[PDB]
Amino acid sequence: NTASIAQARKLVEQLKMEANIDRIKVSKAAADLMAYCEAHAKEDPLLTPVPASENPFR
Amino acid sequence: RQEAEQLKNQIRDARKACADATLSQITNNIDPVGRIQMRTRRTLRGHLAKIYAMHWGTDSRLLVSASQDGKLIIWDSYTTNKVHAIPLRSSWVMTCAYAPSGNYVACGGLDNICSIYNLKTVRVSRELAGHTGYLSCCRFLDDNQIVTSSGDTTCALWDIETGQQTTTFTGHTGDVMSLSLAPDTRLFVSGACDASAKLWDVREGMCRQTFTGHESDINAICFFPNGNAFATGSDDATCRLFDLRADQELMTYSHDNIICGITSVSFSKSGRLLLAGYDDFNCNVWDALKADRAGVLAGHDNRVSCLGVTDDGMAVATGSWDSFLKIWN
Amino acid sequence: QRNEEKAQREANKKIEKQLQKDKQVYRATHRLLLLGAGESGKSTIVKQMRILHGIFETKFQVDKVNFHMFDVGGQRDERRKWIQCFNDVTAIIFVVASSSYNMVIREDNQTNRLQEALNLFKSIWNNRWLRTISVILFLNKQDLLAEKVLAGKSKIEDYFPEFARYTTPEDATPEPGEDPRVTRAKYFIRDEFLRISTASGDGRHYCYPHFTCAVDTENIRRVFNDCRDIIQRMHLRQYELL
Amino acid sequence: DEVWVVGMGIVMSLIVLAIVFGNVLVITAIAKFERLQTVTNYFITSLACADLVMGLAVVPFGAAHILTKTWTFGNFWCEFWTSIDVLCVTASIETLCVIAVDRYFAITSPFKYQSLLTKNKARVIILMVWIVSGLTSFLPIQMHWYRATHQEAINCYAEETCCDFFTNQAYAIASSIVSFYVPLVIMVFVYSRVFQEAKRQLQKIDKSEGRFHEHKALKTLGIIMGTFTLCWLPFFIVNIVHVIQDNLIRKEVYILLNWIGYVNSGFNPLIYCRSPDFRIAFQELLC
Ligand SMILES: Nc1nc2c(ncn2[C@@H]2O[C@H](COP(=O)(O)OP(=O)(O)OP(=O)(O)O)[C@@H](O)[C@H]2O)c(=O)[nH]1
Ligand SMILES: CN[C@@H]1CCc2c(ccc(O)c2O)[C@H]1O
């Protein structure tokens, strides 16, 4: 099967392309997620119940 | 062609080399948000058959839903009264979408055709064909181009004006079931039935990364508001949180008392709460940064198949096989 | 904004009326699902019925009762993820080629073609989402099976070793002129499926075996009778009486 | 003596309660959940409402009258109480007949069941049944067409202390025919047809797949028919007998059989509400 060679090479070129990516430590990613969540924590009605005056479904 | 294992081993070693610490270690002194109680505010009726999908409007006021009766109904959440009702040619529909500009509505299903509608004229505008399998999801990237995912292990980026495929994404092995667009509409992800997810490029049209943390079929996928993470839900009663920059998963959401599958996943505006619908006739509200339950949304008498949160984050709406749409808060 | 509220209330009324009009039509009709193995003759059976009196649809009525049938041939794969959508149908029509007990398929040695059907039927019966759906079974190609069994070149016993220790049922009703070999082959084919059906029936859904060939015009009546029986049995069991 | 009066109060208290509790639970369960709002459940709602009215109105005052041995209210109250009794009793049986006919249509003709029964038609049927029941209770009692013609009857009618049931032949026969004998032959014929269909279906199943593999229908039909027949039969024959020939039945036997009839409202929730959905509803709340 010539087709088999094609898929086998494509799985090799794709894997080579999907291997040379700069990676960062997971601690930095967790810190960034923490910072964003703490930054935008005061603007979501689900987390903090808003007064019934501004609620359109009341 | 025996070098494929070597590259996989190298990728695994590179991923292991950057695992400095677990997310739970960093987020351990945070005071939990505590129990959260939500009550039904509205109940929408009128669907003869059992529902699959829904999509909120961009104004957080209107929403659309599709059912197996062969009918799309555009509701008004504030005054719980209908606006439009569109009969369809084929009664087997599996998806729906709402335009960012509020002018078009798309819906496709078991027939290998994606149809769009012109609300402000209600007649069919164009029919997009070319797929060889059932459609599973579709989203408007803009007012003139749409991205769809079908059951023949492919995705496409259509052009509405000409009705011809522009770019075709290939590389998956199993059926593609769901996708979600980034806030900048420059990248999107997709969850297949081969227990894998991928991060495509809209412009170039080449896959960049592959995550294979799951072990069964993937039914739902969402995307973090920050644009640097996403969450998936599979049939093994687990929700996993991946990260693009680190390139491996960071946290798993599972409980020993639930063994049913997951049908929908969504986030909140702040991203602190993760909402996931189950086959247990109800829904759960996890904690994104702590992996601990925080509430249950009961009230449905059958399977839950839809879920969504408004853009302004004022309410969360669900749709089940009981042919009823409910609005929680 | 008095008109704006009033106008919306005008539209909701126009729809609700349309929905009420359409509900009766939706509830009146009956839906069936057509399914079977490849190279078995489902297309021949469907095309023949109308002249007699990615998806496909068919409309037909018997005794002023509306019936509707959907067949899916575009989505042909071993894994069937779309089958969850068909848990509210009245019945499932299953068609299998009864004469192909000696033929490998796909240029793949595979298994004798009848066995693959058996595996498909077993998977369909034990599905989680089809716990309360009956099955109508059509054993097609009755003449080719009889001729092939009459020929001594191909023997059923070789491919299925359990045929050697098989004895015909005492309640059989062979057609006039039928040789014992044809009757034994037919009833072995029938009870091979009946065993799988009755193993885990649980009393909620049954099976209706049938024999048919090309020259037959009574299938449209058999489907009607089977659907009526299915609904009657469902109603009887609902009231804790059967 | 002293013990008998004490015994009656306890026995009466247990019945008045059970009767109210069963109907209240059924009505609350059917109203709370939308899964149980089936069209065939409307007849059950009407039956439960009728039983609730009977248990709340006629049982307590009847017990008070039988215990006190003297009516303590006016003649108009006596007539109104008799009217309520007759209305509830005659409206608690035609609903059973309607339920039987509905099951007959559901089983015998499965294809035409959807068209023959609609939510709009159920309200019309229920209203017609209630109108017919009210026509034979208030109309011939508020008007004085049911009165008797012997000295004891007129003496009791003049007095304001005795409230006893005296009637002539015509009203007794007509009310008995309207209430009991007409809705009995219909039920018998319907259930015979249903049993025949069930036996035929089971025979077909046994013929089809007997080799690899009778009394449930008998048990269910026996419960449904026997409970009602045993509860309401003797009264609706002594009613004719005592007026056809006098000085044959003592009043105590009359009252005892009539009160035996009242217990029938204490079994309907246990008979017509045994579906698993009702069990789930009962477990969800008040538990
Ligand atoms: N002798 C005989 N041949 C039959 C019969 N039914 C179908 N055939 C033959 O089967 C062929 C037609 O089958 P089709 O209906 O086209 O097959 P199909 O159902 O589309 O097959 P798949 O889509 O692969 O499942 C012809 O060669 C027919 O002569 C039958 O009852 N007797
Ligand atoms: C005193 N109690 C009454 C008397 C006669 C009567 C009853 C019930 C139904 C009828 O059709 C009747 O005629 C009894 O409940």
Side-chain angles (χ1 to χ4, degrees), chain A residues 3 6 8-9 11 14-15 19-21 23-24 26-27 29-31 33-37 39-41 43-52 55-57, chain B residues 4 7 11 14-15 17-19 21-27 30 32-34 36 38 40-49 51-57 60-68 70-88 91-122 124-126 128-160 162-163 165-183 185 187-202 205 207-215 218-233 235-255 258 260-279 281-291 293-300 302-305 307-310 312-321 323-329, chain C residues 7 11-12 15 17-20 23 25-26 28-38 40-42 44-46 49 54-55 58-63 65-75 79-87 89-102 114-115 117-127 129-130 132-143 145-146 148-152 154 156 158-161 163-164 166-169 172 174 176-178 180-199 201 203-214 216-239 241-242, chain D residues 7 9 11-12 15-16 18-23 26-27 29-31 33 36 38 40-55 57-66 68 71-101 103-111 113 116-118 122 124-127 129-132 134-148 150-151 153-154 156-158 161-168 170-196 198 200-205 208 210-212 215 217-218 220-244 248-249 252-276 278-279 281-282 285:
Chain A
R9 294 183 181 277
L11 184 59
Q14 172 65 32
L15 294 174
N20 269 325
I21 306 104
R23 301 170 145 95
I24 62 170
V26 294
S27 79
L33 262 68
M34 172 152 187
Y36 179 83
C37 294
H40 285 67
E43 290 150 19
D44 49 336
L46 274 76
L47 191 149
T48 297
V50 299
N55 191 10
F57 297 88
Chain B
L7 281 293
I11 279 172
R15 285 171 179 197
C18 57
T22 310
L23 167 61
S24 283
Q25 286 183 48
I26 293 173
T27 64
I30 301 299
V33 292
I36 297 169
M38 286 171 194
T40 308
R41 296 288 189 267
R42 303 267 189 261
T43 305
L44 319 167
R45 314 165 209 261
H47 269 306
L48 283 72
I51 307 183
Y52 281 182
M54 71 98 71
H55 201 235
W56 273 89
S60 174
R61 177 91 167 270
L62 305 169
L63 62 90
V64 71
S65 76
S67 50
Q68 303 284 330
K71 208 166 277 289
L72 271 70
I73 302 186
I74 292 173
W75 308 79
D76 195 332
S77 68
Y78 280 20
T79 65
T80 187
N81 63 7
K82 304 163 211 43
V83 177
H84 279 115
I86 313 152
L88 268 75
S91 65
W92 311 103
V93 289
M94 293 177 70
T95 187
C96 63
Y98 204 110
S101 65
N103 281 317
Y104 292 71
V105 175
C107 171
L110 200 61
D111 52 334
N112 304 326
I113 289 171
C114 188
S115 307
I116 63 170
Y117 293 80
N118 194 350
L119 290 187
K120 293 179 179 179
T121 183
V122 186
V124 184
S125 173
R126 194 61 51 71
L128 312 177
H131 272 310
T132 61
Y134 67 96
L135 281 72
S136 296
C137 189
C138 57
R139 288 284 184 261
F140 288 168
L141 193 147
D142 212 2
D143 210 356
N144 208 11
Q145 42 197 357
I146 181 180
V147 59
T148 65
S149 89
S150 65
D152 65 9
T153 79
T154 299
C155 311
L157 171 76
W158 300 88
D159 191 20
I160 288 183
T162 75
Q165 285 187 13
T166 289
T167 305
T168 309
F169 310 106
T170 55
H172 268 166
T173 302
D175 298 331
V176 182
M177 311 285 327
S178 293
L179 61 83
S180 67
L181 288 166
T185 80
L187 289 91
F188 76 102
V189 291
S190 54
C193 294
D194 46 44
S196 74
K198 282 178 173 277
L199 175 79
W200 307 90
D201 194 327
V202 166
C207 174
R208 318 212 78 80
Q209 290 156 45
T210 312
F211 317 93
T212 56
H214 275 287
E215 44 181 300
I218 294 184
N219 294 348
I221 188 156
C222 195
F223 204 110
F224 200 78
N226 199 236
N228 287 293
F230 66 95
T232 69
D235 282 10
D236 52 357
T238 54
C239 275
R240 284 166 199 271
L241 185 68
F242 301 94
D243 196 325
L244 308 192
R245 276 192 277 181
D247 204 5
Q248 71 274 16
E249 82 171 304
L250 309 179
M251 171 85 48
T252 175
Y253 307 108
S254 175
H255 193 274
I258 51 174
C260 55
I262 300 196
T263 65
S264 51
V265 160
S266 178
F267 266 91
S268 302
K269 194 156 191 40
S270 175
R272 184 64 189 269
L273 294 161
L274 171 82
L275 293 92
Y278 285 88
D279 279 354
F281 295 3
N282 55 350
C283 176
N284 290 318
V285 179
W286 298 95
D287 190 280
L289 309 182
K290 284 272 311 173
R293 270 168 65 166
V296 176
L297 271 67
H300 273 304
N302 212 351
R303 195 174 82 104
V304 177
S305 52
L307 191 88
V309 179
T310 80
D312 48 16
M314 211 85 58
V316 54
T318 69
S320 74
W321 280 9
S323 78
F324 293 136
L325 276 158
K326 293 203 188 324
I327 312 282
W328 315 83
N329 184 337
Chain C
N12 183 10
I15 308 307
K17 196 182 301 312
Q18 193 44 230
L19 263 51
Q20 290 261 270
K23 173 143 191 43
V25 173
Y26 169 69
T29 63
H30 288 94
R31 283 161 307 282
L32 310 158
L33 165 63
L34 186 47
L35 181 63
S40 66
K42 49 182 56 70
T44 62
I45 295 170
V46 59
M49 271 144 82
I55 204 76
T58 311
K59 278 318 178 164
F60 66 100
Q61 73 163 30
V62 181
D63 283 9
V65 185
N66 290 318
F67 279 98
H68 194 35
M69 178 182 315
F70 296 96
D71 169 20
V72 48
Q75 303 84 300
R79 197 209 284 99
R80 283 142 173 114
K81 198 98 159 70
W82 41 261
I83 197 166
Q84 306 172 0
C85 300
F86 289 102
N87 80 23
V89 300
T90 297
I92 290 180
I93 304 195
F94 206 88
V95 185
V96 63
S98 183
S99 81
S100 66
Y101 58 86
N102 42 312
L114 177 63
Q115 185 64 60
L118 261 70
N119 277 118
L120 173 57
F121 181 61
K122 193 201 301 293
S123 179
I124 292 286
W125 190 266
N126 296 123
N127 198 317
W129 302 112
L130 310 183
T132 53
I133 308 287
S134 314
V135 171
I136 298 166
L137 188 75
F138 284 167
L139 296 171
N140 205 0
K141 277 169 207 206
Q142 282 284 251
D143 53 49
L145 178 64
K148 204 195 293 267
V149 167
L150 190 149
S154 295
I156 279 183
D158 175 337
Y159 304 85
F160 283 92
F163 184 77
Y166 186 76
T167 300
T168 190
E178 293 200 289
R181 327 151 76 198
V182 177
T183 300
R184 293 177 66 248
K186 290 171 69 176
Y187 275 111
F188 179 39
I189 298 289
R190 184 178 70 109
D191 63 358
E192 191 56 13
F193 280 90
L194 274 185
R195 180 181 297 277
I196 303 181
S197 179
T198 188
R204 264 162 314 163
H205 58 299
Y206 306 93
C207 171
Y208 300 78
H210 284 293
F211 292 108
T212 174
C213 65
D216 189 358
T217 60
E218 63 185 342
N219 288 344
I220 193 66
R221 176 69 53 171
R222 289 173 172 158
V223 177
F224 178 88
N225 284 342
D226 282 13
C227 283
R228 155 187 264 273
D229 266 324
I230 283 163
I231 300 183
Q232 201 163 340
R233 271 173 210 179
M234 185 180 288
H235 278 164
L236 274 166
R237 177 179 148 84
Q238 184 178 2
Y239 295 135
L241 194 146
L242 184 86
Chain D
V11 178
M12 309 278 199
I15 304 142
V16 169
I19 280 175
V20 300
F21 193 39
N23 305 144
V26 176
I27 292 173
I30 190 171
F33 303 137
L36 293 175
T38 317
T40 187
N41 282 110
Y42 291 171
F43 310 120
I44 295 170
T45 299
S46 179
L47 187 144
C49 282
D51 291 331
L52 194 55
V53 176
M54 161 145 68
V58 65
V59 184
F61 283 107
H65 170 42
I66 190 167
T68 300
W71 193 257
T72 64
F73 305 87
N75 281 312
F76 171 80
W77 294 119
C78 172
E79 311 276 349
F80 197 68
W81 180 68
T82 297
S83 310
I84 292 296
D85 189 358
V86 176
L87 183 141
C88 277
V89 164
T90 197
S92 168
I93 308 179
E94 316 200 345
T95 311
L96 300 163
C97 188
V98 164
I99 294 177
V101 168
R103 280 158 185 230
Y104 174 60
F105 286 165
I107 285 181
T108 286
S109 278
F111 280 157
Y113 189 36
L116 264 68
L117 192 173
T118 317
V124 169
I125 297 169
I126 280 171
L127 285 189
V129 175
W130 270 96
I131 278 165
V132 174
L135 199 83
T136 181
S137 64
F138 276 99
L139 188 152
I141 288 182
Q142 306 273 65
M143 294 299 291
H144 284 338
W145 296 318
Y146 88 105
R147 268 173 149 72
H150 53 74
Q151 170 67 270
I154 59 173
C156 193
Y157 282 162
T161 51
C162 62
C163 169
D164 291 337
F165 197 80
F166 294 106
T167 185
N168 63 7
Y171 172 71
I173 284 169
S175 66
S176 289
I177 286 173
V178 166
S179 306
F180 188 67
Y181 290 111
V182 167
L184 180 58
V185 291
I186 305 179
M187 275 170 79
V188 160
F189 162 71
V190 172
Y191 282 147
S192 67
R193 293 285 281 118
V194 167
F195 175 73
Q196 272 179 37
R200 294 174 64 187
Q201 271 301 318
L202 188 153
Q203 199 69 51
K204 205 161 300 313
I205 289 170
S208 177
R211 284 201 311 151
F212 317 106
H215 54 278
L218 183 63
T220 309
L221 284 188
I223 282 182
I224 290 160
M225 271 320 268
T227 300
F228 152 77
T229 298
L230 183 63
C231 277
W232 272 124
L233 179 55
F235 182 89
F236 278 111
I237 190 166
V238 306
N239 200 16
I240 312 292
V241 165
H242 93 287
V243 56
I244 288 300
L248 286 198
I249 294 93
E252 292 92 7
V253 176
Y254 204 92
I255 297 188
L256 188 41
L257 291 189
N258 174 347
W259 264 83
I260 288 304
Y262 289 160
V263 189
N264 190 25
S265 286
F267 292 140
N268 297 334
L270 262 180
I271 292 166
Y272 289 95
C273 307
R274 277 208 320 285
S275 70
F278 269 119
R279 315 289 311 278
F282 291 159
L285 58 93

